[model samples]
Target chain A: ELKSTRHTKYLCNYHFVWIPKHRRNTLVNEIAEYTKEVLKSIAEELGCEIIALEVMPDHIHLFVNCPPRYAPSYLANYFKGKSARLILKKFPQLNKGKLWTRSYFVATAGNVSSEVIKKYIEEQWRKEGE
Target chain B: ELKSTRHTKYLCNYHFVWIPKHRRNTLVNEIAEYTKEVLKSIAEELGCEIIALEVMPDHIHLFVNCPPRYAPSYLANYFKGKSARLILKKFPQLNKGKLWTRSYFVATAGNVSSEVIKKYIEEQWRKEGE
Candidate 1:
C-alpha cells in the first residue's frame, strides 16, 4: 500500500538486525564507524537525506527522508548489499556466512512527530537501567 | 507535521533508548520480558496496536498501528512514564537514578512500505558481523 505525500521530503525509519550464528560476540566501535560511512554513501546515491542514525552492537537504526518514487525495499537492498560486500572486503572473517537475514522491517514517518523520535533515540539507554 | 492517511489504519515505527549510566552494563533476559509487558499494556490503554517489537540490550524498537488522534508523543510519554515507575517499583535498585531520558524518536509510516521496514529491522544484526 502506497500513500501520497504533499511534501517533497519523505521521512523513513529503518532498523537492521544481525544475528549471532554461533554465540560469537561481534561488538566493536570500529564497526559502527564503517557502517555509518556506508549508510551515508547509500543515502546520497538514492538522493535521500538521513536525519538521525544510531549504531548499536547488535543492530543499527536509521531515519531518512526520500522522494516518492524511491521504494524502501530497493533502498534497503542497496544498503544491505553494499555494506555486506564492503564489510566482507575489509574483514574477510565475515565473508563465509550470511551477514544479514533475508527480511527486514520499515515504517513511514508522515504522521509521527520528529521531536518524539529524537527523544526515543536519546532515551534508548534508560531501558538498561531497569 | 501531520500527514493524512488514506487508510483507516496508520503504521508507525518507534525506537526507545535506555542508557546505562556510569559505564554500567545492564544486560538481562528478564528485563526484556518485563519491558514487553509494560509496552503491551500501554498499547492497549492507548488503543494502539503493536505490529512488531524487539528488545535489545540498551534499547528497543517498536512498530505499531495507531489512530490519528493519538499522537506519538503521548504514546511515548505514557510508556516512558509508566515503565519508569513500574520498573523502579519492582526493582528498588533502579529508583536512585533516572530511568529514561527526556526525549524520544518517533517516525510516521506514510510513503514507505512495510516490507522495507521489516527488512531494515531484520537485517540490523548484519552490522555486527563485520
Candidate 2:
C-alpha cells in the first residue's frame, strides 16, 4: 500500500546497505540485538516505516519506506550517525576507529520489490552460527 | 554491477513517475518524441545513467541510475523543471499553465528489480493509439 501526506501520495522505499569499518565480524549476539533496537527507534522517531532490517556480522541491510520530504542521503547519514553513536557508546569494547564505513549502497524499491529485498537480506549469511 | 566514484561504490537507481496537469492526454506523436529526446539530453547533462524511459498520454516514467550526490527530490524537480521549460516552449500547445503536476512518484530498485520496473512501464497504456 502507498502512503500519503495531505496532498501527496508517495511510495519512497529505500534499500540501504552498509558495512562496518574494516569489515569486522563484530556484530554478535548482544551488540546485534541492541543495534537493531536502536535502528528501529530512530526509524520510528523519523516517521519511517521499517520494511525489513538485518544485522550481519560485518554489514547491515535496512529496507524502509520513507516520506518524500527526506532524501536518501539524509536518511543514511541520520540512521548511521545516531545508531553509531548509541551502539559504540554502549559497546565501547568493539570500537576501533569508526563503527561504519563512509560509503553505503542505497536504492529505491517499489511495492513488489520488497519481497526480493527481504528474501535477499534473509538469505545472506544463511550459514551464520551454523 | 555497481558503479564507483573514486571514494564510493554505489548503485542508486530511481524510478520516477509524474503526470501532466489535470491528467490530460497531451503526449503523442511529435510532442512525445521530442519530450523523450529532451529528457535523454537532460539526463546526459546531469550524468545520470538511463535505464528505461516511457512517455504515456497523461504521465511519464523515467528510470535512471544516479550518483549519491543527487537526491530523489532534486532529480524529480530538475527533470520536471528543465523538461517542462523546454518542452512547453517547443510545443506551446501544452502551455496550459504547467506541463507537469507538482506530485511525483520516486522509488529505488535493486539489481534484480529492474526487470519488474521495465515490464511495468512498458505494459502501461499498452493499447494506446490502437
Candidate 3:
C-alpha cells in the first residue's frame, strides 16, 4: 500500500547497491550477518520499511519502501553512514578508511522527467543582469 | 569546490521550495528556528551541502549542493520527511496531520533538458509488448 501524509501518499522505494571500500570481500561470515541486523534496526528507526536486502561478499543490495519525503540519496547515505559507523564500532576487525566507498547505485521505485528549468535559470540570470 | 566519487564528480545542487499543508502560515519563531537547525544537520549527515536556506511562514527554500549518486526526489523527501517528524515530535501542539503538503518545488542545481529519459519512458512499454 502507498503510504500517506496529509496531502500525499506514495510508495517511493529505491533499489540500492554499494560496494565495500576497494571491493574488499570482508562482508562474509559473521560480519555479513551482523551488518544485516544493524541495517534492519537502523532503517526501522528512521521510519523506512525494508522490502528486500542482500549482503554479498563485496556489496550490499537493499530495496526499501521509503517515504515520499525521503530522497534516494539521503536513504543511501543514511544506511551507508549509519551501518558503517555501527559495524566498525562493534566489529573493528573490519577496519578500513571509510567502510564503504563513496560511490553508490540507486534508482526510484516508480516513474520519471522535465523542462522549464532552463527558462527559469535564464530568466533568473536575466533579471539579475537587468 | 567539487565533490566526487571514483567514477563521478558532481555539483548536483537543487533549489527547492515546499509549502506547509494547506499553505498554513504556522511557521514562526521557535518553529522556524527549529526547522532551520533540523535542515542543516540533516543535509550534512546525508552528504549534502546547503548553500542557502530560507524558512518563511508559509514555505521553506533550500539551495543545496548534493552528491550525484542521490536523486533530486530523494533530497526533497529527506528535508520534508525529517523536519516534519522532528517538528511534530517536539511540538505536537502545532500538528494537525502531516506537516507538509506532498507536492514540492525543485530544480536541478547544475543543469538539465536531457532528451533521453523522454524517449526512454515513451518507448519502454512498446518494446515490452513486442
Number of the top candidate by TM-score?
Answer: 2
In lDDT terms, how accurate is model 3? 0.66
**What DockQ would you assign to candidate 2?**
0.18
| DockQ winner, 1 or 2 | 2
**Residue B125 in candidate 3 has what lDDT?**
24
Winning candidate number (lDDT): 2
The residue pairs that clash in candidate 2, if any, are A108-B108, A108-B109, A109-B108
Can you list each candidate's DockQ? 0.13, 0.18, 0.07
The residue-by-residue lDDT of candidate 1 on A1-130, one tens digit each, is 1122331122344332233232234435676577778879888988777777765555555677654344445555677777777766776655366555544444555554446544544444454233
In model 2, what is the error at residue A89, expressed in angstroms? 2.9
* Real interface contacts reproduced by model 3, as a fraction: 0.11
Candidate 3 per-residue lDDT over residues A27-89, each given as its tens digit: 888889999999999889888889788887766778777655565567778899999999888
TM-score of each: 0.40, 0.74, 0.47
Each model's lDDT comes to 0.54, 0.72, 0.66
Q: What lDDT score goes with residue A118 in model 1?
A: 43
Where does candidate 2 chain B have its weakest 10-residue lDDT segment? B121-130
State the lDDT of candidate 2 residue by residue for B14-128, as single tens digits.
Answer: 7777677643457888989999999999999998999888887766778888876776778888999999999989997776798876766666666445453333223321311
RMSD of 1: 18.5
Candidate 2 residues lying further than 4 Å off, grouped into runs, are A111-130, B111-130
Give per-residue CA lDDT, model 2, range A21-55, as digits (tens).
64346687899999999999999999999999988
Scoring only the A-chain of each prediction against the true A-chain gives TM-scores of 0.65, 0.82, 0.80
Model 1: per-residue Cα lDDT over B30-123, one tens digit each: 7657877887888888766777776555555666766444434566667778877877677776655866655444444555654654454444
